[PDB]
Amino acid sequence: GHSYEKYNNWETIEAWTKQVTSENPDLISRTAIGTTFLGNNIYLLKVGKPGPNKPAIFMDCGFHAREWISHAFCQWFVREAVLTYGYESHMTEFLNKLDFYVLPVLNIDGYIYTWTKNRMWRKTRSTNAGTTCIGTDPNRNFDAGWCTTGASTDPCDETYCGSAAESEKETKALADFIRNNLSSIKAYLTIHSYSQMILYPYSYDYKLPENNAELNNLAKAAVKELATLYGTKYTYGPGATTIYPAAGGSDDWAYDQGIKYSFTFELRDKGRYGFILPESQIQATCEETMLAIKYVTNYVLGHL
Numbered sequence: 001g002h003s004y005e006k007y008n009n010w011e012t013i014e015a016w017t018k019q020v021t022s023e024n025p026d027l028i029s030r031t032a033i034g035t036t037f038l039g040n041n042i043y044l045l046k047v048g049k050p051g052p053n054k055p056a057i058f059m060d061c062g063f064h065a066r067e068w069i070s071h072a073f074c075q076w077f078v079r080e081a082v083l084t085y086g087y088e089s090h091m092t093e094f095l096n097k098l099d100f101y102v103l104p105v106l107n108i109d110g111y112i113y114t115w116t117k118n119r120m121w122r123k124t125r126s127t128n129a130g131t132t133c134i135g136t137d138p139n140r141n142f143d144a145g146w147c148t149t150g151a152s153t154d155p156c157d158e159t160y161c162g163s164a165a166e167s168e169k170e171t172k173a174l175a176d177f178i179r180n181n182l183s184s185i186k187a188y189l190t191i192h193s194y195s196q197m198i199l200y201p202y203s204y205d206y207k208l209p210e211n212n213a214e215l216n217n218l219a220k221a222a223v224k225e226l227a228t229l230y231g232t233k234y235t236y237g238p239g240a241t242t243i244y245p246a247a248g249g250s251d252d253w254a255y256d257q258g259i260k261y262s263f264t265f266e267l268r269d270k271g272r273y274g275f276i277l278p279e280s281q282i283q284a285t286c287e288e289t290m291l292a293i294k295y296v297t298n299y300v301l302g303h304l
């Protein structure tokens with residue numbers, strides 16, 4: 001049984017992806033872009049008014065298994081899109097002019113693991129050689145200054161960068177989809193928790209992005225928009241200095257491919273509850289995050 005105000009297990013999220021597609025068959029289509037190490041289907045939703053060669057915004061949730069408010073947000077976002085499309089000017093224009101690619105859970109194997117054995121698991125669940133330790137950090141597994149800084153070469157560590165860039169089937173699947181659609185994808189948004197930040201490149205080096213000016217200004221505006229609702233305070237900036245260095249991230253990789261609007265969101269809270277954010281806070285967190293996402297969508301649309 002699914003709720004937008006509770007955390008749902010994978011079986012339920014998987015059924016939800018099929019359910020929401022069947023109820024909105026002319027607004028939403030569903031695809032599997034690959035399978036996890038354990039063989040689960042990695043689903044991607046395409047949301048928008050059907051039309052030839054539209055630009056798109058790409059958003060994923062659930063890179064990291066324990067960051068449950070991330071998964072909850074992609075679901076919240078899709079419902080908001082559907083509920084307001086057709087009679088809210090902004091969202092109606094949004095889905096008229098572009099598509100959203102929503103990947104509700106990337107790291108499905110880990111998510112199941114956090115529901116069944118260890119709530120605090122982070123990584124994938126693939127096997128490693130030379131050690132009994134399991135898993136690779138998906139946000140260390142992309143071809144962006146891979147394993148050069150901010151990652152561990154130790155497979156027992158939480159930031160293990162993997163056997164090689166895109167060693168993980170999940171990261172390969174995501175990377176492969178985006179490569180094929182680099183033409184249409186105009187923005188990349190990846191949702192994490194916690195610590196209340198908006199990050200943009202770079203994380204694999206203290207080097208600043210070409211349009212560092214444009215991105216810093218957009219993030220500043222986004223966090224101001226988000227705080228309007230509940231006063232929630234976000235910080236923002238290039239990844240390496242705003243949080244810490246972390247090579248192999250999907251946002252840096254997205255930006256180096258030609259996606260000049262690439263952001264990582266870190267949602268509530270700032271550590272009081274951390275990854276175990278109370279379900280009573282799901283709605284508030286999602287509502288305010290929507291304001292930032294919509295602000296970014298409006299901008300990308302305008303400068304498209």
Ligand SMILES: CC(C)[C@H](NS(=O)(=O)CCc1ccccc1)P(=O)(O)C[C@H](C(=O)O)c1cccc(CN)c1
Pocket residue numbers: 064122139140158159192193194195199203239240243244245246249250251252264266
């Ligand atoms: C709480 C939140 C800040 C997460 N950090 S974490 O779970 O403590 C990372 C694991 C860890 C734990 C202890 C010591 C070293 C690493 P995150 O996992 O969502 C941060 C994210 C990452 O580490 O992949 C991150 C950090 C820096 C830059 C970017 C943008 N690519 C993204």
Ligand SMILES: [Zn+2]
Pocket residue numbers: 063064067192193
């Ligand atoms: Zn994370």
